[PDB]
Symmetry: C3
Subunit: 282 residues, 3 copies
């Protein structure tokens, strides 16, 4: 069996480097050549105790694209609830407001795997996976990358996980651009230091745009098209979404915008995971 | 190569008479011979930004009847941005929004992922008009030479206006407008009818014209309800072919005793939404349709 | 088949023969699934009142037969007009509504589209799941010794299951409930008229050795010390304190399997309603 078979996917950290690369190869394959019947006859529950239209739609589309059916709730004793649901369905995609809830479901779901679509505000494994997949797709690699992370690096959910994931690769250089009150926390700088991974701090984008392979904008530090003069041809601008004012609309039609394509990649990342946890061979 | 392939469907007034007849011929064909695998392997987003259960269920049913999957929501970020993301996911988008205009939204997207307007901020609801048209055509055999009355609020319901505009692309139609003064069909509609030399007349009551009607279209205050409600007694002296239509819901405009008459066709009309909406989805997503 | 295009308003309206057909069908679908039986069918799931467990079970059942689902999970136009419209869209309607008699009202306006009642007002298809489970495990629905424990007064679950089992032969009911929560006199009257044996008790041990089935609605594993080998403990759920978690460990534990059996019992109902054979 592939190593993820009937494995609960709760945290991105619970995947080894080998496991990430597997998911990513699988996602690339599915994007290139769809398998509309891979999960035929499977029924997957979409349990969004917490509403999250964007993530739910992505997961449901992923499930349908693999030929499986979806039953669920789009908004709201868990132990027993999951002990019952798990008697009906082949997998459970869960989103819940309290961190630890997905793991709890997992303690009771038996051989039915739980795929976490978000557990509290920080743990979002498929967001990290789609971020990684997008960097891989656009740059051809996850090593030797110049990546900037801009905005709120203190309460930025997706950005801590992303940094930790990329830190497992070789030769990356992180450029952290944030207000002092919202700097990337110390424990993250600490691990980068201990892994001998290069990072640098800058007051703004202007000065480092020429160096970047990826500009990751978090939810003055607003990005506008004018700021992208001198960019590398391979530069991609990412944002986990939604954006409000941090990326002006004029960026959208430059060759560097890739936030919508990045969201679109969520389908492949999520299909790959569903495929791997439900099919022993692949 | 069909003219609606990879085209957004936003306002019914954007379709020519030829395009309207294509949609209707396609709807009639799907009513007679379903094609449950036509959109096999397609995923269609059902994006309802306000609850609109009847219209949403009709669209989702239509999608399934063609063999496609449905993803959606049945009830901040710009709408453009929401659709930019969803457009990367799905093959087509059904969109209902109580505030935003479907026209502005659609102008920003190519029709490679067609957007079908299920009702927007400007009150454009093209598939309501299509199903009304299909219902007149299938019960009367034609969309020309129809005597049609529109009764109730003719000022503020856009769907009665769009139906009038669409019917005015055909010949020999006679419109009977029955409304209180405060709710008169607008002058912008009457001027168009005169320009085209389309006959219309105003009446204070339904009872004056029932005998000559082919279609009685009832629209969706104490005085107004009081004297414009339709009862089965009102239908004595009617043509055999008369059909009573209503976009729904009817609360008080049509008494339940009309439901058993041979003329009641508002539920069948609603059922015709399935074929009109299937036809549209079929046409925007398939170049060739045989 | 006798349930073809019939409305299923009440499991209690079904005869012994019809119950047995639903149960044979259920057993057949559990053993050998028919994932395309209802291919190209569209079924409405109209949950006016939310009931997540029941709705998910019905929707899963629908997808397991290859049919599509449209509907709503919760939610002035008459119910009559709403159903007059929905019945023009779909092939069958599963509905749950807070008004007593809603599904029967709906059935008056749905033409030839069958209505399956998932619960009107004071509510249940739970009785089918219960029957199927007893049959599956006990190999029969006749000569069964069954104990119902808890609140027998307001427990419409036990009422409908008692009514259902009373359609079978030689069943023996052991009613265990607080004095004030007694199985109502009108139910006992029905058993007495049918010459169906029942007995009243104050406690659950002391009867365990005689049971084929123990139906809960205060148990512990210690209580089933001298249980019969074929015994099964059942509970419709959602449980709270009635059954302890150490009973989940026991080998007579069958409430989750019972719950999982909803899929087959509900698929069976829908298959029979929508297919001649």
């Amino acid at each position: 069996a592939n190593p993820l078979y009937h494995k609960h996917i709760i945290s991105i950290n619970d995947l080894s480097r080998d496991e990430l690369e597997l998911v990513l190869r699988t996602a690339a394959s599915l994007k290139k050549t769809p398998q509309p019947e891979l999960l035929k006859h499977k029924v997957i529950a979409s349990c969004f105790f917490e509403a999250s239209t964007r993530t739910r739609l992505s997961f449901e589309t992923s499930i349908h694209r693999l030929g499986a059916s979806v039953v669920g709730f789009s908004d709201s004793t868990l132990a027993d609830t999951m002990s019952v649901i798990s008697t009906y369905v082949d997998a459970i995609v869960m989103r819940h407001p309290q961190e630890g809830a997905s793991r709890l479901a997992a303690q009771f779901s038996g051989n039915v795997p739980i795929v976490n679509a978000g557990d509290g505000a920080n743990q979002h494994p498929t967001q990290t996976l789609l971020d990684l997949f997008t960097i891989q797709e656009t740059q051809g690699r996850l090593d030797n990358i110049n990546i900037a992370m801009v905005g709120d690096l203190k309460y930025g959910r997706t950005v801590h996980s992303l940094t930790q994931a990329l830190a497992k690769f070789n030769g990356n250089h992180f450029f952290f651009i944030a207000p002092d009150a919202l700097a990337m926390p110390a424990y993250i700088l600490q691990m980068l230091e201990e892994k001998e991974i290069e990072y640098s701090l800058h007051e703004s984008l202007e000065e480092v745009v020429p160096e970047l392979d990826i500009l990751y904008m978090t939810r003055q530090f607003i990005l506008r098209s004018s700021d992208l003069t001198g960019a590398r041809d391979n530069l991609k601008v990412l944002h986990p979404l939604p954006r409000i004012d941090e990326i002006t609309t004029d960026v959208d039609k430059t060759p560097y915008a890739y936030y919508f394509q990045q969201a679109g990649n969520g389908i492949f990342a999520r299909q790959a995971l569903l495929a791997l946890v439900l099919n022993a061979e692949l």
